[PDB]
Amino acid sequence: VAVLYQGVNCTEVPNVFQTRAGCLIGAEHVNNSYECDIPIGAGICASYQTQSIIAYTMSLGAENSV
Amino acid sequence: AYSNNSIAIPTNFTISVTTEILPVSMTKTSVDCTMYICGDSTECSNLLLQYGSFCTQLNRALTGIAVEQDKNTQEVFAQVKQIYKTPPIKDFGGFNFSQILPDPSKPSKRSFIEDLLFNKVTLAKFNGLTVLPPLLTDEMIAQYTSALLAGTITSGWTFGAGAALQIPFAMQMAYRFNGIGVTQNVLYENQKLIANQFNSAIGKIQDSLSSALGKLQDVVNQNAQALNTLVKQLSSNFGAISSVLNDILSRLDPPEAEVQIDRLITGRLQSLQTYVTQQLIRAAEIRASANLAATKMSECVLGQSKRVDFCGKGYHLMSFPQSAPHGVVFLHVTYVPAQEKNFTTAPAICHDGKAHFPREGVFVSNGTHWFVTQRNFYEPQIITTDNTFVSGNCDVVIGIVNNTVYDPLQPELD
Amino acid sequence: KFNGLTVLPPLLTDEMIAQYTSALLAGTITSGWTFGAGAALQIPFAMQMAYRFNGIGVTQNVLYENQKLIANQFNSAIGKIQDSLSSALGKLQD
Amino acid sequence: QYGSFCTQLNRALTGIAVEQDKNTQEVFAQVKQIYKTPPIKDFGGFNFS
Amino acid sequence: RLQSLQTYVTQQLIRAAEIRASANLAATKMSECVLGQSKRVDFCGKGYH
Ligand SMILES: *[C@@H]1O[C@H](CO)[C@@H](O[C@@H]2O[C@H](CO)[C@@H](O)[C@H](O)[C@H]2NC(C)=O)[C@H](O)[C@H]1NC(C)=O
Ligand SMILES: *[C@@H]1O[C@H](CO)[C@@H](O[C@@H]2O[C@H](CO)[C@@H](O)[C@H](O)[C@H]2NC(C)=O)[C@H](O)[C@H]1NC(C)=O
Ligand SMILES: *[C@@H]1O[C@H](CO)[C@@H](O[C@@H]2O[C@H](CO)[C@@H](O)[C@H](O)[C@H]2NC(C)=O)[C@H](O)[C@H]1NC(C)=O
Ligand SMILES: *[C@@H]1O[C@H](CO)[C@@H](O)[C@H](O)[C@H]1NC(C)=O
Ligand SMILES: *[C@@H]1O[C@H](CO)[C@@H](O)[C@H](O)[C@H]1NC(C)=O
Ligand SMILES: *[C@@H]1O[C@H](CO)[C@@H](O)[C@H](O)[C@H]1NC(C)=O
Ligand SMILES: *[C@@H]1O[C@H](CO)[C@@H](O)[C@H](O)[C@H]1NC(C)=O
Ligand SMILES: *[C@@H]1O[C@H](CO)[C@@H](O)[C@H](O)[C@H]1NC(C)=O
Ligand SMILES: *[C@@H]1O[C@H](CO)[C@@H](O)[C@H](O)[C@H]1NC(C)=O
Secondary structure (H helix, E strand, C coil): CCEEEECCCCCCCCCEEEECCEEEECCEECCCCCCCCEEEECCEEEECCCCCCEEEECCCCCEECC | CCCCCEEEEECCEEEEEEEEEEECCCCCEEECHHHHHHCCCHHHHHHHCCCCCHHHHHHHHHHHHHHHHHHHHHHHHCCCCCEECCCCCCCCCCCCCCCCCCCCCCCCCCCHHHHHHHCCCCCCCCCCEEECCCCCCHHHHHHHHHHHHHHHHHHCCHHHCCCCCCCCHHHHHHHHHHCCCCCHHHHHCCHHHHHHHHHHHHHHHHHHHCCCCHHHHHHHHHHHHHHHHHHHHHHCCCCCCCCCCHHHHCCCCHHHHHHHHHHHHHHHHHHHHHHHHHHHHHHHHHHHHHHHHHHHHHHHHCCCCCCCCCCCCCEEEEEEEEEECCEEEEEEEEEEECCEEEEEECCEEECCCCEEEECCCEEEECCCCCEEECCCCCCCCCCCCCCEEEECCCCCCCCEECCCCCCCCCHHHC | CCCCCCCCCCCCCHHHHHHHHHHHHHHHHHHCCHHHCCCCCCCCHHHHHHHHHHCCCCCHHHHHCCHHHHHHHHHHHHHHHHHHHCCCCHHHHC | CCCCHHHHHHHHHHHHHHHHHHHHHHHHCCCCCCCCCCCCCCCCCCCCC | CHHHHHHHHHHHHHHHHHHHHHHHHHHHHHHHHHCCCCCCCCCCCCCCC
């Protein structure tokens, strides 16, 4: 599982990744961007794609130039 | 002036651009039953523990509203999967979309008019009353709107049914005119004028906005008013000696304190339930408005619309979407007839015992001749066998006149 | 009215609504739809009906060669409505 | 000392009150020119008496 | 008497929302059937309009 402490500064603690949604604990941060699997918030989603949990930034879609 | 042999055709046409505003969602909140009702005391929590499962029921309702908000935003905007980009070359036959395209200089990729709309709703945590972030950041919505604009200008409607097909802009406008019953050559022979009209109209919108957004303001005002009432309601006695549970932790022992703690509990439950109910009704209303906004998005913008007064007053030509805080804005580009002239008419012309009718136009006469013209634009043409069609004998039609049809075959036979 | 329970008048008196409806009727009969997009353009009534037929895929000469019959049909139908009403309004009653 | 429930109620009721006027305005006020029919009644045999 | 007043107000709010929906639909009929000819089936009576 992963845990989310909403509204709390990550530095204050009762793998840590500070999202605007709140200090996220237990998951890893990557640099890719895929479809959104489950919504965390504030433009950040997460998934069990790779096995551990990852939290990534959702990407709207593939790109083309007519 | 209605007379049984008179009609009034326009001569000139005027473009126009009109704005429209819609709300799409509200600001999501979540509340703590225990923190609001009891503060922090153990005794109050112990006494509430037996009232029921009202707290849990409330939380379920509030989270339901929360998730519908994300669905509303998703539905209104996420209708395209390819994030198109405009080409650096800007040649659209004289049209000028500088204003409502993305300007790559500002940090937030917002167009000029989007930026103006943003700076008009200035909006006017310590009790268990939390607000939560939306799912999509504003840059994402900006990207979606930019993609829609690129799609319409470079591909017409054809991106909304399948793969994005390119086509110049002049012929897209020509097709859109043909779709309201005005032939193509009308557009072609006047392109410079339509271009100037459109530029001036968009400039006037840009000016008028920087003066208007009541519909998007009332939502914020209602939200803030409700929260202020729900918070201010914590300073009434509801029939106790005081309105602070710390004023009751002291100066009393449990046996006779519990009755006043009871009265405070009752008051604060009743306040919470009123807040939740009114919120549910408001959310349903916004849900209705968001469904309507998605429908406009999918009918006016994705393709041309034809149902009257659905995408602005006047015959509809196209639309452009723009964003705004917690809402969407439409710019409907539409068409209007300007300068009228009176002409005399007649249903059919009997050349030689045969009733000739117009294929798609209507017969007009400036007093000296007969021409046949299209319905919405005065453009005379001469009667031929390639322009009418026959039926019966000219004896049953209530209105008939006498004229000869040119029939361009006889002279050529030599 | 004697307990703090007040009713209030609407904004528009019924004559005003009557005027609005009369205006709409005048617009449709004397100008077709063209008053709903811009200036009111006049056009006889026979050709307005002809255009409305053409808009559902029935050519114009169909209307023209039978105008007296459409007129009688319409009169009889409106008379039957006038009779049937004077007999029905549950939706407005509830 | 019960609270501001009265004021809250009054605000709700007045909200309904103003929406009523907006509904009537929207359904009917769609024309700005108050046209008049001509005294001549010749519509090809139709009869709008 | 507080409890009675609140029940009355709530039911009134729900009814008003329903009438609001009906009035939007009526305005749409007014603006599509009357102002111009309509073409979407079964929106302005049974049969071609
Ligand atoms: C249709 O209306 C437009 C709007 O006035 C006319 O355009 C003007 O034409 C005059 C004379 O050609 C110019 O001096 C003006 O500068 C034009 N307007 C603008 C904004 O530039 C147009 O001429 C009209 N159509 C016809 C056939 O006369
Ligand atoms: C109605 O339009 C016709 C066509 O333009 C006018 O007839 C022309 O008039 C000019 C000026 O006298 C002549 O030079 C042309 O040779 C005429 N052409 C034809 C085919 O007749 C006519 O004068 C117009 N009538 C009115 C009352 O304006
Ligand atoms: C169109 O021309 C025809 C051919 O002359 C007209 O038909 C005759 O009109 C006169 C008018 O007095 C009648 O007396 C004749 O009985 C008609 N029939 C024939 C076979 O000559 C017709 O009336 C003209 N239409 C008009 C003037 O509106
Ligand atoms: C969290 O605390 C650090 C200092 O410990 C501070 O620099 C940072 O701005 C804080 N962030 C938030 C969101 O409070
Ligand atoms: C992700 O990007 C940041 C900065 O671009 C970099 O420091 C980091 O090493 C990158 N991580 C991976 C896994 O690529
Ligand atoms: C378009 O409008 C902008 C804004 O006034 C102007 O700077 C520009 O020169 C116009 N023309 C083109 C081709 O961009
Ligand atoms: C046509 O002429 C009549 C003359 O009485 C006038 O009343 C009417 O306004 C005119 N209409 C147009 C469109 O020129
Ligand atoms: C049109 O009305 C006039 C009355 O001014 C009448 O003389 C004429 O016969 C009418 N024509 C038709 C076709 O009804
Ligand atoms: C129209 O109907 C009315 C009502 O029966 C009748 O009095 C009148 O004669 C009819 N015809 C005309 C032209 O008004």
